[PDB]
Amino acid sequence: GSASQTVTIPCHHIRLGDILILQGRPCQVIRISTSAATGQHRYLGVDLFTKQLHEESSFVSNPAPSVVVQTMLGPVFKQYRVLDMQDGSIVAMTETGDVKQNLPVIDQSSLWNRLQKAFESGRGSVRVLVVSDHGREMAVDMKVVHG
Amino acid sequence: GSASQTVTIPCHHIRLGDILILQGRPCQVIRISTSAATGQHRYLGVDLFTKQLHEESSFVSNPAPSVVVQTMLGPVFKQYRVLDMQDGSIVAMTETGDVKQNLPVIDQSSLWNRLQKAFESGRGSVRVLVVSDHGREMAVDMKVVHG
Secondary structure: OOOOOEEEEEHHHOOOOOEEEEOOEEEEEEEEEEOOOOOOEEEEEEEOOOOOEEEEEOEEEEEEOOEEEEEEEEEOOEEEEEEEEEOOEEEEEOOOOOEEEEEEEOOOOOHHHHHHHHHOOOHHHEEEEEEEEOOEEEEEEEEEOOO | OOOOOEEEEEHHHOOOOOEEEEOOEEEEEEEEEEOOOOOOEEEEEEEOOOOOEEEEEOEEEEEEOOEEEEEEEEEOOEEEEEEEEEOOEEEEEOOOOOEEEEEEEOOOOOHHHHHHHHHOOOHHHEEEEEEEEOOEEEEEEEEEOOO
16 A cells, blocks of 8 residues: 655765665665755665666755755665575564565575575574565565574 | 754664764764674764763664664754854854854864865855754864855
8 A cells, every 4th residue: 555664864874885765666876976956965776676777866854943954765674584495585474473485585795695504503593684665575684683 | 951953863874984972972983883692783982072982882672563673863963154264163154143153163084174165265155064062062064055
């Protein structure tokens, strides 16, 4: 019925490589420039799912006198337990016990190999970070949790 | 009666050099580490006013199932017009016309020299970014506004 949950990120806390919502799409930022006519920052990113390039400029708000803030939207990452691994997909489990049988892992920064070495040395401590896009979920990062 | 306005920053959007509120103080982060017992990030920064070192660990929240977020607090910067400059202090003006006669400029990254060359080539386009601390205000960055 909607996209997902988003968080507001100030523009001075956005660097190359960050994941931003560019025109409703989760994108990895690959170029940051500044509009000369407006002063907004314009962000060029790669869609994590379609590998397509999207552009979006920042939003300027004026919430109080002498307070001008430029923001973008970021995705809210979910943490899923990894129960098993087998060809590209993993078997994940949410915090409430909901089981995902065929969760795909993004081919980015050789994440599947880092996820496989951590899984075979501590199964209960491996998490994946998941981005939801209009029902499509994908693991984009990992995180080892010591308890 | 209070500190100032703060914004919540996700920890994965915090890099060395950022300005964070460490134990109520505006600090510039100079080291980022991770606690092995808790997984929180602990942040070492330099107080912008006292030049003292402070430490603080991140806050972990669980706002929805399978959503674990680590955050810190950042300062809300104000934009002030620069009307004049003379020995270290500048004459600033807020967006509503409130005049600050002796606003100090931080000695960081040679900001006074960058602020002086921009002032003498476009007075109406120079802004300072100001951090408030318990009444004490200080310009910590500049920004040229084309209109």
